[PDB]
């Protein structure tokens, strides 16, 4: 039933990002991807910050993006044997990890002359994947709070921008986009 | 760290307006530079140089914005 | 050292001087405009000091970002 | 004789330089220093094919004055392009330093900022002097006289506005400074 409420409340806000997500004339790709990645990170961060009091251990006993999909934490050298985590714990680990990635002067240079690493696009795509996992969990489990908090428009706009960017540069496979493809097909028209 | 709803809503509206405006302004600087540079000049090498430094400045700006150098 | 062409240097110089005078005139305009509007509203001396602090901070920040690098 | 042109569509310059109301001195000096750094950089960049090892065997601002390198770490007798290479590289390293020239907002300037700023400005003026003395005719022929004089006029206006270079350093071009500043 979640799909039909999600597709009912798709209409949101009061423009076209599709031109704005495009790589500007003569702009380095890695820098663009980095900037938008950090931006989306902040967005999703405070977004989840709004409904964190609804997202408790009891409400979300396991990291779920709908009854069909269930995510497990891993893929970090520290804490490497996969753990069956709850919503707030998993999301905590995720956002903390991404935060540590963005704060790394090696992967995301702060100085001007410092160039990006060779494997930057990969970890960028990883980050974006996991951020989408957060998006999916919020959209599936804690959607009623978004409605009552009247944050529906802002959530849909943020997600729309995210999807426009990702699709613009093909940074997330559709297999990961699966839990929300029904919505993605609608927002991208 | 939890945020209030009104804060988030404001952030999103302000952010969207900022993105669209910044994009529009970028395209505006590019077009403006092209028009004035075309108006009373000039070799093609010079255009390439000016465009290169401008693009470098833009990339630097978005890098600083990425580096949260606004505080 | 990287060799720039003469047309580039000339163009940049011409554009730059005009930019300097314009930025000067605009700065003074913002300052005077703030002083007049804040005087009009009728405000405490502490409040006026606060507003001036914020304006000066915004300006100083502006030229700081412009210093390395901004567009 | 010989008119100095100057440009043209605008010139305030004096006014332009003045420290704005309630603006930090170090920030102003920093910004203007960076601007002048770029200006001089591409300026010398246009006539780089004339300032060669053969043409300028030593960094000279006239037969009276001769400059030698040593700071980056025993003075070295360098040519025009080599000396200027070392100079601009050094200043570049100073500007890229996050300690002396803060990029963040809250980060304040060090206490000894004015010193290295004045050093930078001295050496940049040394470049101005060398171009004006040795490689000046190409600037004329390239029709950059107006731009060179305007840049130098602005530079001198700034320096004089804040007393950042001693007259002993400005000596090789004092005859010109007296003319441009009227
Ligand atoms: Cl994974
Ligand atoms: Cl010295
Ligand atoms: Zn949850
Ligand atoms: Zn020379």
Residue numbers in the entry:
A (entry chain B): 23 to 36, 39 to 213
B (entry chain C): 631 to 701
C (entry chain J): 630 to 700
D (entry chain A): 23 to 33, 40 to 101, 105 to 213
Give excerpts from the publication:
Furthermore, our complex structure between the phosphomimetic form of MOB1B bound to the LATS1 NTR domain also displays a similar structure to that of the pMOB1A-LATS1 complex. Phosphomimetic substitution of Thr12 and Thr35 with an aspartate residue also induces enhancement of LATS1 binding. Intriguingly, the phosphomimetic forms exhibited stronger affinity than the truncated form, implying that the phosphrylated N-terminal extension contributes to stabilization of the unmasked state. Indeed, a loop region between the H1 helix and the phosphorylated Thr35 residue contact the LATS1 NTR helix. The single phosphomimetic substitution of Thr12 activates LATS1 binding, and the double phosphomimetic substitution of both Thr12 and Thr35 induces further activation. Thus, phosphorylation of these two residues should cooperate to relieve autoinhibition by N-terminal extension.
To exert full kinase activity, MST1/2 and LATS1/2 requires coactivators, the scaffolding proteins Salvador homolog 1 (SAV1) and Mps One binder 1 (MOB1), respectively. Phosphorylated MOB1 protein is switched ON to increase the binding affinity to LATS1/2 and this binding accelerates auto-phosphorylation of the activation loop, A-loop (also referred to as activation segment or T-loop), of LATS1/2 kinases for full activation. The phosphorylation of MOB1 occurs at two threonine residues, Thr12 and Thr35, located at the N-terminal extension out of the C-terminal globular MOB core domain, and is required for binding to LATS/NDR kinases. Here we report the results of structural and biochemical studies of full-length mouse MOB1B in the autoinhibited form and that of the MOB core domain bound to the NTR region of LATS1 (hereafter referred to as the MOB1B-LATS1 complex).
